[PDB]
Design a protein around this ligand. Sequence first.
Ligand SMILES: N#Cc1c(N)ccc(/C=C2/CCCNC2)c1Cl
Lengths: 19, 353
Amino acid sequence: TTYADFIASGRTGRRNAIH
Amino acid sequence: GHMGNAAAAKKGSEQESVKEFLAKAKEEFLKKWESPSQNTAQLDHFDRIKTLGTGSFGRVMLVKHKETGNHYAMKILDKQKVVKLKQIEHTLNEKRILQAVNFPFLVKLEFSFKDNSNLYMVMEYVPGGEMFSHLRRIGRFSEPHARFYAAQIVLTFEYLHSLDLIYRDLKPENLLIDQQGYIQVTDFGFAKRVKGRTWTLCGTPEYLAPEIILSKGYNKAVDWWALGVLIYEMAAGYPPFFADQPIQIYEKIVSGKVRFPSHFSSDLKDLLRNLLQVDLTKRFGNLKNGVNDIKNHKWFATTDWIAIYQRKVEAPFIPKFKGPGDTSNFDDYEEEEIRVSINEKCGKEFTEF
Ligand SMILES: N#Cc1c(N)ccc(/C=C2/CCCNC2)c1Cl
């Protein structure tokens, strides 16, 4: 599922800005 | 047509009253923009309580004002680290913006000062913690809950854009929830006063508009794209474009092929297809009718914009608060000393602070 793919992406925690 | 006479007259009057409000707000902003305030306290006026957040430049600490007992959030920036990371202008601009703006969903700067080592911005303490935390705790927000927060962002961007400020840092991590359940926006390090176009690559991958990724210049409509991403993530629990690595996220954004959960309403999907529009001649917020295309969309038909501004709407979530200075809605961070050198560092770079 899309949600499972979200979990698999590893980007489920706080996201950093590019710089 | 879609409105009878009374409704049309009411909408027209509302829209003209917004213009009148914004014209006065701009006049007030420009006075403070040209004459900023500075040096309104010192470090030993405050007791340090707990670190609320840390990043490459510095950290944000819960503090208590000794003489009054009031709690505040103090951002501490190490001058040498700011110079090293090429953030001098962003740091000075953030302070300049915070001391000039005034809006119920924008955090207030209560004091600022500097010493040999650091810069200090003393802001309101917002005790409910980050929207990010609450969203991940419950998974997704129902559409009314998402809409309550979205409405506050629409009004805040309407205000900022009237001042020619582009925001560029929207995401749930950067939105705090106050004791009444309303949203506070705090971070202005990526904001810029822009009357036309600008080019800087900055932001967070999932929230970048296509025209920021691509080399072409862009305008304030990137913020309306970002609102689309926020609304999508609030209502789905995950953002519209994600992947293992940023370059793959960027590829998806510039295709802009967006798919929706089966529980999204048709009204929500229509709004999002018009915000997450790659074509700038079609993106809501960037057309002749401006922000009114958003505010008059069906998904917002139940939203009383004035009542949101007046904070008279009951919020969907009221944070638990156990007493003054309670930090139970924030994550724990390592506690480090606040060192102040005997020698002044980077004095000339930070004269304006
Ligand atoms: N209360 C409060 C408060 C404030 N007035 C300003 C900033 C922060 C913390 C961060 C660190 C993560 C990125 N956004 C800014 C906080 Cl917690």
